[PDB]
Design a protein around this motif. Sequence first.
Motif, mmCIF file in Angstrom:
data_model
loop_
_atom_site.group_PDB
_atom_site.id
_atom_site.type_symbol
_atom_site.label_atom_id
_atom_site.label_comp_id
_atom_site.label_asym_id
_atom_site.label_seq_id
_atom_site.Cartn_x
_atom_site.Cartn_y
_atom_site.Cartn_z
ATOM 1 N N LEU A 48 28.706 31.069 18.929
ATOM 2 C CA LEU A 48 27.828 30.512 19.593
ATOM 3 C C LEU A 48 28.024 30.174 20.942
ATOM 4 C CD1 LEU A 48 27.554 27.583 17.029
ATOM 5 C CD2 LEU A 48 25.784 28.949 17.424
ATOM 6 N N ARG A 49 29.240 29.886 21.255
ATOM 7 C CA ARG A 49 29.736 29.664 22.819
ATOM 8 C C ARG A 49 31.437 29.872 23.018
ATOM 9 N NH1 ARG A 49 29.714 26.489 27.924
ATOM 10 N NH2 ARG A 49 30.172 24.165 27.711
ATOM 11 N N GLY A 50 31.608 30.479 24.107
ATOM 12 C CA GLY A 50 33.002 30.943 24.642
ATOM 13 C C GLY A 50 33.266 30.396 25.632
ATOM 14 N N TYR A 51 34.658 30.087 25.934
ATOM 15 C CA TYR A 51 35.528 29.612 27.113
ATOM 16 C C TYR A 51 36.460 30.445 27.555
ATOM 17 C CZ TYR A 51 33.193 25.155 25.200
ATOM 18 O OH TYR A 51 32.187 24.294 24.741
ATOM 19 N N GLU A 52 36.409 30.319 28.967
ATOM 20 C CA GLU A 52 37.486 31.243 29.632
ATOM 21 C C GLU A 52 37.849 30.497 30.859
ATOM 22 O OE1 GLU A 52 40.047 34.194 28.339
ATOM 23 O OE2 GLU A 52 40.587 32.337 29.935
ATOM 24 N N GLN A 53 38.883 29.940 31.007
ATOM 25 C CA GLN A 53 38.950 29.234 32.562
ATOM 26 C C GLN A 53 40.271 28.744 32.873
ATOM 27 O OE1 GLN A 53 35.615 26.327 31.697
ATOM 28 N NE2 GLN A 53 37.122 24.778 30.882
ATOM 29 N N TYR A 54 40.738 28.787 34.335
ATOM 30 C CA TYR A 54 41.793 28.381 34.650
ATOM 31 C C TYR A 54 42.022 27.329 35.789
ATOM 32 C CZ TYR A 54 43.191 32.916 32.686
ATOM 33 O OH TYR A 54 43.357 34.120 31.830
ATOM 34 N N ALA A 55 42.828 26.640 35.834
ATOM 35 C CA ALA A 55 43.184 25.725 37.259
ATOM 36 C C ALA A 55 44.502 25.772 37.788
ATOM 37 C CB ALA A 55 42.768 24.149 36.401
ATOM 38 N N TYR A 56 44.778 25.442 38.961
ATOM 39 C CA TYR A 56 45.875 25.265 39.739
ATOM 40 C C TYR A 56 45.858 23.653 40.028
ATOM 41 C CZ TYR A 56 49.402 25.957 43.184
ATOM 42 O OH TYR A 56 50.626 25.908 43.770
ATOM 43 N N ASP A 57 47.261 23.259 39.819
ATOM 44 C CA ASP A 57 47.556 21.919 40.289
ATOM 45 C C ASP A 57 46.386 21.071 39.769
ATOM 46 O OD1 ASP A 57 50.107 22.426 41.445
ATOM 47 O OD2 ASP A 57 49.539 22.635 43.309
ATOM 48 N N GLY A 58 45.807 21.166 38.637
ATOM 49 C CA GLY A 58 44.944 20.389 38.069
ATOM 50 C C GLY A 58 43.594 20.335 38.469
ATOM 51 N N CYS A 59 43.195 21.370 39.185
ATOM 52 C CA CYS A 59 41.701 21.691 39.803
ATOM 53 C C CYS A 59 41.362 22.939 39.326
ATOM 54 C CB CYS A 59 41.816 21.627 41.452
ATOM 55 S SG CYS A 59 42.341 19.958 41.967
ATOM 56 N N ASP A 60 39.966 22.923 39.287
ATOM 57 C CA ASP A 60 39.300 24.051 39.008
ATOM 58 C C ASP A 60 39.690 25.293 39.807
ATOM 59 O OD1 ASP A 60 37.591 22.751 37.412
ATOM 60 O OD2 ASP A 60 35.947 22.863 38.169
ATOM 61 N N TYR A 61 39.935 26.403 39.105
ATOM 62 C CA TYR A 61 40.242 27.641 40.003
ATOM 63 C C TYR A 61 39.164 28.842 39.752
ATOM 64 C CZ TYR A 61 42.759 31.608 42.050
ATOM 65 O OH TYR A 61 43.081 32.459 42.803
ATOM 66 N N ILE A 62 39.162 29.122 38.444
ATOM 67 C CA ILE A 62 38.112 30.174 38.137
ATOM 68 C C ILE A 62 37.759 29.846 36.610
ATOM 69 C CG2 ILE A 62 39.753 32.117 37.583
ATOM 70 C CD1 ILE A 62 37.854 33.970 39.091
ATOM 71 N N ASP A 114 38.621 18.441 32.604
ATOM 72 C CA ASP A 114 38.722 18.223 34.055
ATOM 73 C C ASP A 114 40.382 18.504 34.158
ATOM 74 O OD1 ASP A 114 39.296 14.766 33.478
ATOM 75 O OD2 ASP A 114 40.012 15.637 35.357
ATOM 76 N N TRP A 115 40.982 19.018 33.330
ATOM 77 C CA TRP A 115 42.293 19.442 33.215
ATOM 78 C C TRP A 115 43.395 18.467 33.204
ATOM 79 C CZ3 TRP A 115 42.251 24.251 32.407
ATOM 80 C CH2 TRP A 115 40.994 24.993 32.703
ATOM 81 N N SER A 116 43.254 17.021 33.209
ATOM 82 C CA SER A 116 44.071 16.134 33.083
ATOM 83 C C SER A 116 44.825 16.003 31.777
ATOM 84 C CB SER A 116 43.393 14.796 33.588
ATOM 85 O OG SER A 116 42.453 14.543 32.882
#
Lengths: 98, 8, 273
Positions: free
Chosen positions: C111-125, A58-60
């Motif tokens: 088995l499982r891959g991850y690729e994710q971004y966040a801006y100011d602590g919030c889901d972005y993409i 959750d990024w925290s």
Amino acid sequence: QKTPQIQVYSRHPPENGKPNILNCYVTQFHPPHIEIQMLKNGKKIPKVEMSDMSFSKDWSFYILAHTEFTPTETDTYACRVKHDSMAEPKTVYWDRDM
Amino acid sequence: FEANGNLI
Amino acid sequence: MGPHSLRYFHTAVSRPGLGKPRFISVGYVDDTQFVRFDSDAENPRYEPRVRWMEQVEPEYWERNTQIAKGNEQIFRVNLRTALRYYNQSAGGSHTFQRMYGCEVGSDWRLLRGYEQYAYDGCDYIALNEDLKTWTAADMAALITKHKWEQAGDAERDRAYLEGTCVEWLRRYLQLGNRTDSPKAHVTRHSRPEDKVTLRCWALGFYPADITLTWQLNGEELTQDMELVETRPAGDGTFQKWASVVVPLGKEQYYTCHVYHQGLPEPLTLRWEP
Ligand SMILES: [Cl-]
Ligand SMILES: [Cl-]
């Protein structure tokens, strides 16, 4: 802005007069800027080894402060944490009876 | 061994 | 061993007026930190954070230093772009985050891959589980989804996770010279009423993945357990506790169950003076 949760605990079950690691685990906060304070009857403990920061799904942010220490029946320990989400320092004392 | 990020 | 992972955590924090952003990468094999880059030095370098990385040739550090500086630059550009996308004023402090990585089983395939971004602590993409499509978290990110789809970026990120990531994970696990089994105890604690807390502790275990469950008469609880998230003990092991509130005198109708990779079979225990 997410508020830091604080957990205070040892590695082993605490025995009065036995080498142990105290731990102050501060987590779930944002932004990352933080000064954490490990204490002993009010006074500062010198040379507290910090882990590097990281974060959860959750990024925290998460960080561990930890020192060596000899617990005693009379002596207390605590963690006051300095963060931008709060008005004033949030304090959690070591519950050893836990 | 690390990957390049992407431009948003 | 069987189940393993390689994960990287990227963070930039801006500070207009003061300088360029501070950018950090931290790598983990399983639940152990092994590398780090921190842009807040005069000549910052990719660095080992464990014993079994200290003998790795200089070329690995140099190459990853250049990749980390490239990621610093990407994060700096994204932080500027994000101010426009979210119509924010200048002068404030902001963060940009990325988490990526892979998990493998015993066969060494992804088995499982991850690729994710966040801006100011919030889901972005985020890359979806198929490693083929993106989920934008809001309208602002919807433009990035479009750009990354037109450019075919999911394929390249897919190829990395299916190849490089999984293969270097395999390499890192051959380095140096194992599982730490949990030791469990149950403690009893008083409460105001004629009830009592049973706290079940798991200590000294690695990796961090564990399951602590209480049961009443060998079946699922009706009450909700209290628990803490699994947490580092300061020596590279982890601890956890889960708890239940029970009638005074009925403590032994309740049992704690501990599942961990290290254990031959699950532990079963109940309170005992
Ligand atoms: Cl910048
Ligand atoms: Cl129950």
